[PDB]
A paper describes a structure:
A crucial event of the splicing pathway is the catalytic activation, which takes place at the transition between the activated Bact and the branching-competent B* spliceosomes. Here we show that catalytic activation occurs in two ATP-dependent stages driven by two helicases: PRP2 and Aquarius. Here the inactivation of Aquarius leads to the stalling of a spliceosome intermediate—the BAQR complex—found halfway through the catalytic activation process. The cryogenic electron microscopy structure of BAQR reveals how PRP2 and Aquarius remodel Bact and BAQR, respectively.
We reconstructed a cryo-EM map of the BAQR core complex at about 2.9 Å resolution. The cryo-EM density map of human BAQR enabled the building of the PRP2core and of the accessory N-terminal domain (PRP2NTD, residues 265–295). The PRP2core from BAQR is in the open, post-ATP hydrolytic conformation. Instead, PRP2 has now moved around 85 Å deep towards the branch helix and the core of BAQR, filling a large cavity between SF3B1 and PRP8 within BAQR. In this post-translocation state, PRP2 accommodated seven nucleotides of the intron, assigned as the 7–13 region downstream of BS-A, in a channel framed by the RecA-like domains on one side and PRP2CTD on the other side. In the BAQR structure, the translocation of PRP2 displaces several subunits, including the RES complex from the top of SF3B1HEAT. The largest subunit of SF3B is SF3B1, of which the HEAT domain exhibits a distinctive loose conformation in the BAQR complex. Because the pocket is also a hinge, SF3B1 opens widely to unclamp the branch duplex from one side, like an opening pair of tweezers. Indeed, flexible elements of PRP2NTD, PPIL4 and SKIP form a stable 3D assembly that bound the exiting RNA strand at the nucleotides 17–20, downstream of the BS-A. Notably, the residues 371–400 binds PRP2core, such that a 310 helix intercalates like a wedge between the two RecA modules and the HB domain of PRP2.
Residue numbers in the entry:
A (entry chain G): 160 to 190
B (entry chain P): 9 to 108
C (entry chain B): 10 to 16, 18 to 80
D (entry chain C): 490 to 1304
E (entry chain E): 458 to 601, 604 to 621, 629 to 656, 682 to 689
F (entry chain I): 53 to 73, 77 to 87
G (entry chain N): 759 to 953, 958 to 1019
H (entry chain D): 3 to 91
Amino acid sequence: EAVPVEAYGLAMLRGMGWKPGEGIGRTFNQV
Amino acid sequence: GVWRNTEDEILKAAVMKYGKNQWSRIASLLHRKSAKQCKARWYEWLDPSIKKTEWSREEEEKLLHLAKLMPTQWRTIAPIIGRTAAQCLEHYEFLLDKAA
Amino acid sequence: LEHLQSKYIGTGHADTTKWEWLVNQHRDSYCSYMGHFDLLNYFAIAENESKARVRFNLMEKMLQPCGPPA
Amino acid sequence: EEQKERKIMKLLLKIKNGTPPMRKAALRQITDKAREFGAGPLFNQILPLLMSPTLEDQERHLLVKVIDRILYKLDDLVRPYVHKILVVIEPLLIDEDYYARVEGREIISNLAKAAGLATMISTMRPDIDNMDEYVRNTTARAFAVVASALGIPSLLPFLKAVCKSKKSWQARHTGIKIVQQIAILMGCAILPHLRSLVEIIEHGLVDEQQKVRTISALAIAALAEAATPYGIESFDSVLKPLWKGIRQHRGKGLAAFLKAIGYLIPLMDAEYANYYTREVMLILIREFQSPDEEMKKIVLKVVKQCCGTDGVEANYIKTEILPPFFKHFWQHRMALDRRNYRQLVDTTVELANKVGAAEIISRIVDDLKDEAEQYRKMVMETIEKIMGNLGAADIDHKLEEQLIDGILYAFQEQTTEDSVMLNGFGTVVNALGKRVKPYLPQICGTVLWRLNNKSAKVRQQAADLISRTAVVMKTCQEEKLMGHLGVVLYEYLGEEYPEVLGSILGALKAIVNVIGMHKMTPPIKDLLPRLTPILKNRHEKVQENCIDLVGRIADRGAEYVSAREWMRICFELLELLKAHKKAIRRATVNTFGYIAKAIGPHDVLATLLNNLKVQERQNRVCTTVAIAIVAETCSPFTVLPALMNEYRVPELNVQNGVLKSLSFLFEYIGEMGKDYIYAVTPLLEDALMDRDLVHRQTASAVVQHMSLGVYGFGCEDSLNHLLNYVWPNVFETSPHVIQAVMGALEGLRVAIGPCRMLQYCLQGLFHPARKVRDVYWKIYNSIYIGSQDALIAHYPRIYNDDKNTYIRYELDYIL
Amino acid sequence: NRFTVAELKQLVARPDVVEMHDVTAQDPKLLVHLKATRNSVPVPRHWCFKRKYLQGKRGIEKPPFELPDFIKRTGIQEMREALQEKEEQKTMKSKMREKVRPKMGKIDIDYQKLHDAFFKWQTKPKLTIHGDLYYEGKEFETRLKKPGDLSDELRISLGMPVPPPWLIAMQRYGPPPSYPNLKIPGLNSPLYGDVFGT
Amino acid sequence: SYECKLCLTLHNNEGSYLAHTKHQTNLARRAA
Amino acid sequence: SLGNVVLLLKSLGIHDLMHFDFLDPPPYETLLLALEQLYALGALNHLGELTTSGRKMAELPVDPMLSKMILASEKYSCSEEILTVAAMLSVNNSIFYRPKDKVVHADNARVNFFLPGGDHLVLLNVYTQWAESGYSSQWCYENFVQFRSMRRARDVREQLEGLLERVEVGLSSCQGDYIRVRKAITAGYFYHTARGYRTVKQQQTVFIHPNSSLFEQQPRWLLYHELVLTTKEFMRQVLEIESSWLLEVAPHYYKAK
Amino acid sequence: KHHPDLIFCRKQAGVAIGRLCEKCDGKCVICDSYVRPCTLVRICDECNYGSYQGRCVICGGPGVSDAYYCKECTIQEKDRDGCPKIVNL
RNA sequence: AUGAUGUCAUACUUAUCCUGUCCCUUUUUUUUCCA
Ligand SMILES: [Zn+2]
Ligand SMILES: [Zn+2]
Ligand SMILES: [Zn+2]
Ligand SMILES: [Zn+2]
C-alpha cells in the first residue's frame, strides 16, 4: 500500500551485497 | 447516395427553371450527382404530386386487398392507390407489424 | 512560449507585482548605468568621485534596489 | 531517528512532487542539515532511490544533484559508506549508455573528491586480483575513474606497487588495464606522467604471460595515442624489445605488438622510423596472408599509420610494400566485407596521397574490368576519391586510354542504380579535362548506342551520362559533336516514358547551359515550340526538368521567341502552378518573373489577376508570389495601380490575394518600399477595418513586412497610423490572426521603436482584467526580450513611494 | 479590501482617469498613476462587450474602395472596368480560344505616367495621431466642426455671406446653455472659413 | 456574401440562403 | 520476467528470494518489479508476506496477473465468462489461422467473431460458438481456428473448473452483462494500462497491432495483456474501458486521472 | 508555413555549422522565407555530434547545403535566439 | 441584440503535406452408483 514497504527489501539487498551474475551485461572493446 | 437539403433546393429550382424532360442540364448544376439520380430523386421524394398525408381507411383497405391479390408487385400496386411504391411498402410493413 | 523567455531578465507574468517590476526596472537601470561608459561618466564626473568609486557605489545600489521589498 | 527519516521522505516528496523552486529549497534544507541527518539514512534513502528502475531522466539528474550536494556537504562523513556506494556505482561505472556512464563518472568523481583515495584503494585491492574478467574490468574502470578524478601522482606509486607485485598475474593485468583505461580517459593530461607510466609498464611489457604482454602492448598503444606527439623518447625503452617481440610473438599478442608499433612509429626520429619500417615490413608482408579479420584491420591501420609517418621515403614504399599489398589486399573477398572495404579505400587514398596516385591507378585499372559488381564499385569509388584528392596530371596516355576503356566497361555493366559511379565518371572525366578529346567520339558512340536499348533504365542512365559529361564536352569547344548530340536528343524528345524524358530534358538543359544560345543546334526558335506541349505533362520529374529548361531559356535567350508564344507559356504555367512539389511551383514563379522581364509586365499581370480571382482552391498563394516576383523584377510602380484597382472587386477572395501579394512584394523589395508606403497606407487602413479576420490577418502580415522592410528611413508616422488600427485587433482568439498580430507587433516594435510600444503597454500591464493584462504582459515581455537595453531610457518617470525609492538621482546629475 | 471611487479620486490628481471597475484591481493607485500620463492609450472597448471586435454588423452595405488621386489620374480603372465588362460577356469557348491565341497590347499606355504618379505626383496622405484607437464607430463623428460655428452648407442654405440671419438673435441671446464653454468668434470672442467659432 | 436581414444571418453558399426559408419565426419577431 | 514463479517460490515458504541458490542469480530489478506487482496485486502484506488470498493466488497454476480474474470473480459475478477468457489467454500457440494465400476468407472468418469491447469478448464468443456445436473439428476448420491450441484452452478451462472448490468460487454467470465482464477484467488488469499513444506509467509510446480487433476505431481508454516488441512497440489483446471503474480497483496505484 | 509544436533546442550556440537537405532547400530556418540569406546557422551541441552528422536542421533528410537565416529575422537579430534544429517533442 | 451548445454541411487560413507499421521456444496434483 505505502511506499517504503517496497523499499525495505531493496535496503536489505543494498546492505547485503551485489553479485555480478545478476543483471550481467556484456560489453567489451568499447571506445 | 445521400441528399442534402441544399441539393434538394437546387434540384427544385432547376426543375422549376428547366422543366421536366431535361435532366443532364439539371445535373450540370449539381456537383457529384447524375441525371438518373436527379430524376429518381424528383420522382421519388420531391415531386409535389406525392401525397404526403396519412392513410385513410379506404386507402389501407385497398392496400391490404391489392397486396393480397398481387404479391410483392409494388410498381403495379402503387399507381392504383395513388401513393409511391416505397410509401405503400413501408405502410404495408407497418400494418403487418401492427397486426402482429 | 518558452521557459527561458519567462526566465529572461526583465520578464514577467500576469500576476507580476508592481514592487517586483519596479525593482527589476531599477536593477536594469543600474546595470545600464554600469555598462555604459558615457552614462557612468555623466553620473560620475558631475560629482567629485572616481570612476571605480562610482562603479562600487552602483554595485552597492544594485543590492540596495532589493533593499526594502514588500 | 524516526522524525529525521520522516523529514527525509518529506524532502523527497517535496523534491519529487513540488515545484523546482520548492525542490531547490528542499535541496538547500537537506544540504543545510546534511551533517545533522548524517550519511547513514541519506545513503539508505538514496541507494534504493538510485537502484529504482522507475526513475525518469530528470529524476536521476536530480538524484545526481542531491548526491553531489550531500557529498560536498559531508566530505569525509561517508567514510564507512564507501563500500556500499562503490557497489551501487560499479554497475553505473560499467554503463553502456553515454549519459549513464557520464553520471557514473560524476558519481565516482564525487566519491573520490569526498571520501579519499586510500579507502577506495583498500576497497579495490581485494577486487584487483579477482578471477573473473568482468569483475576485473569493472574494478579497472572504477580505479581508472578514481585515478582520473584524484590525479595521476595520487595513486601512481600505488599503481606501480600493484604492477610490480608478483603475487598474481591477474592483478598485474588489472593494473595494466587501469593504466590503459586511465590513459584513455585522460588523453593529453597524461603527458607529464608519460615517462613515469612508461617506466611502470616497462616491467609488464616483457612479461612471459600472453595476456599480460597483450594488455601491456595495448596500454603502450593507448599511451602513444593519448600523448600525441610528446614523449617520443620516454617510450624508447620499449622501442628495443617490442621490435624484437614482433619477431617473437604470434597470434593476438603479435597483433597487439603490431598495433603498438603502428602507434609508436609516427613520433620517432626519421632514421629510427626508417629502420623500424624496414624491420616491421617483413612481418607485415607475412601478415598480409593472415585470414583473421581483426588482424587484417590492425595491419591496415598500421599501414595507414606508416604511410602517414613522414620520412618513410617514396621509392622504398613503392618497391617494398605495394606489390604484395596489391596482390593480397585487392581481391573479391576484401571487397565483400563492408567496413574492411571502406578501410581499404581510405588506406589506398592515404597511400596514393603519400606516394603518388599514378602507380595505384596503373595497378588498379584492370579491376574496373572485373565481373564482380561490388568489387568494381569499390575500385571506381577509390579511383574517384584518388582523382578528386590528387588530380589527373600524372596520368600517362596509355594509362588514360586504359582508364577510359575501364570506365566505359564499368558503365556498360551497371545492373543497379549506381549513381555514385555516375558521379565518379563525372569526377574522372572532369579531372582529365582537355585530354579526353581523342576519346570523345568513342564515348559518344557508346552512349548513342545504349540510347536505343529496350530497357528504360539504360536510356535514362545514358541521358544522365550526357548530362554529366556536357561540361567536359564543352571544355574542348568541340561544338560539332555537342550539336549532333543536341540534334539526337531533339529527336529523342518524343519519348513516352517519364523518367527517360526527364533525363533527356536535364541533358538538354546541361547542353544549353554549356554551349549558349547562338551556337545551339537545333535553334531556340525550333526548340521552345517543341518544349511547349511537354509542359502539359503530369509527371513530376518531366515538369521539374522542363520548367528548369524553360527558365534557363527565358532568363538567358528570350530574344528568339515572340510574345504570343510566351503568353501561351504563361497560360500553361497557370495550370502548372497546381502541382505538388514546392520546387516546381518556385521555379514556375521564377519563370513568370523571367517572362515578365522579357516581354513586359502588363498582360502577364492581367493573366495572373484573372487567375487569382478565378481559382478558389488550394493554390493561388503562389499566384500572389508570382505577382510579387513580377513586380519586384519589373519596377513596382508599373504594377501597383492594377493591383490597387483589383481590391475593388467584391469577389471575397481576390482581396486577400491582393493583400498577400502586397506582403510578399514588400518582403521581396525590402528598403525600396518607402516610395509606396504612402500609396498602400489607405488600402491597409481600409483592410484592417473589415469584418473578416482574414483581411485583418493578412493586413497584419503587410504591416509586419512593411515595417521590417524600410526600417531606418523615417516612415514611422504611417507605421504608427497603421498601428492605431492593428492594436485594437489584439483581442482576437483565432491562432493564425493572433500570430499575425504578434508578428506585426514585433515588426512595429523594431521599426517605430520600443518607446511607443511601452507607451501602448504601460496603461494595460496593470489592467484589472486577467486576460487583458495577460495579453498585455505577453506583448510587454516580448518587447522587453527584444529591447532590454533600450527600455531603461524609455522607462516612465515615476516618483519615489513609501515602499522604496524610485526616482534615480544619477539621471539628475549634470556635469 | 478595496476602497471606493471617492478615495481613488482623492488620492489621484486625475479623477477623470479613474475607471468604474479600476477599484477592484490589485494596484488601483498604480493603474491610476499610469493612466494619468500624457502618452497613454485606453483599453479597447471589446473587453467589456460580449460581441467580438467588428463582428456584429451582419446587415449593412459599404462602398468598395476609394482610390487615391494619382492612381485615378493614371486612369487604370476605366480600361480595367472595360476589360472586365468585355470578359464578362465572353463565353468559355472564347476563353480557351483566347487562351490558345492571346491578344496583347490591351492597355499598353507607357511607363512614364506611372513613374510620375509614383514619384512626381506622390502626395502624403492624412495620418491620425499616435494616441488614436479605432473602434466600432470612429468614422462618423468627424466634428473634432467646432461648436458655436455654423456649417458651410447651413450658411449657404440660409444665405450667410462670408452675416447669418439668426446670428443677431444668437448674439442677443448670449451663449447657449448646452455648450457654455463654446465660444463663437465674431460675436462673443472677437473665424477663418466656415469655422467661425470654437 | 449573402445576408438575411430578416434573420440577420450570413451565408457561405447560395444554397445556404436557399435553405433559409427558422426564418418564419424570425420574420414574425422582426415584424414588430 | 519471473512474475509467475515468484509466487510459486513464496508459496513454498522461501523468503530469501534474492539470496536463493541458483546456477546463476536472476537480476534484482526483475525481482523488484515482480514484488512491486505482487504488492499491487492482492497477495502481499505490508511485510512482504503471503496472505490467504495469496494462497488462493497460488492454488491454481496460471499467471497471477491472469489469476486475479478468479478473485475478481464473485465481486462482479460472471465467473464462467472470465474463466473461458482466461482459458483463451492461457494458450501457448496463437489462435486463428492465417495461411499463405487465402487471406480474405480467413480475415472474414476473424471479422465474423468481432464484438465491441476488445478481443477478450471475441475469444469468449469463439468458445461460446464452439459450444453447442458438438466441439467439432469441422467447425474450427470452417472458421479458420486451430484445432490444436483451443482444445488446450478447453482442457485449461476444464482444469480451472475443477480447481474451483479449493478457491471456493461458485459457477457464476450474468448472460449479457459484458460490462461486468470487462469490469472484472479491469479488476484483474490494472497494471497493464496505456493511453495517449503512450504508457500512462512508463511513458513509452505504443502502436496498435494489425491483428487486433481494434486496429481501426482507436479508443478513449484501453488496457492490454502483453507488450511484445518486434518492429513497433505493439498492442496485444486490447480491451475497451472508460477509466471510470479504473479508480474503483487498486486505489493505491491509481491517482490523478 | 509553421506549426505550433516543435520547439527547437533553446540552447547556447557553438561552432557547429547547420546543414540543409534539398527537399526544404533555400528556406529560412525561423520564418520559412526565401529572401536574402545573410547569416549562417549555428547548431549548438550534439545535434551535430554523433549519428546526426551533416543532417537537416529541418525535417530530417540528408543535408546537402548550408542553412541560413534571412535578413528579416536578423533585423531583430533572432539568429542569436539559439539552435534552430527541430527536436520532435 | 449578438453568450454557450452540438461531427450537420459550406466557405476560409498556415508558400502545411501528396506519406508508414502482422510472435522463437514452451512448463505447472490429489475423492460414489444398483436383481
Ligand atoms: Zn431569414
Ligand atoms: Zn529538410
Ligand atoms: Zn527568416
Ligand atoms: Zn541544438
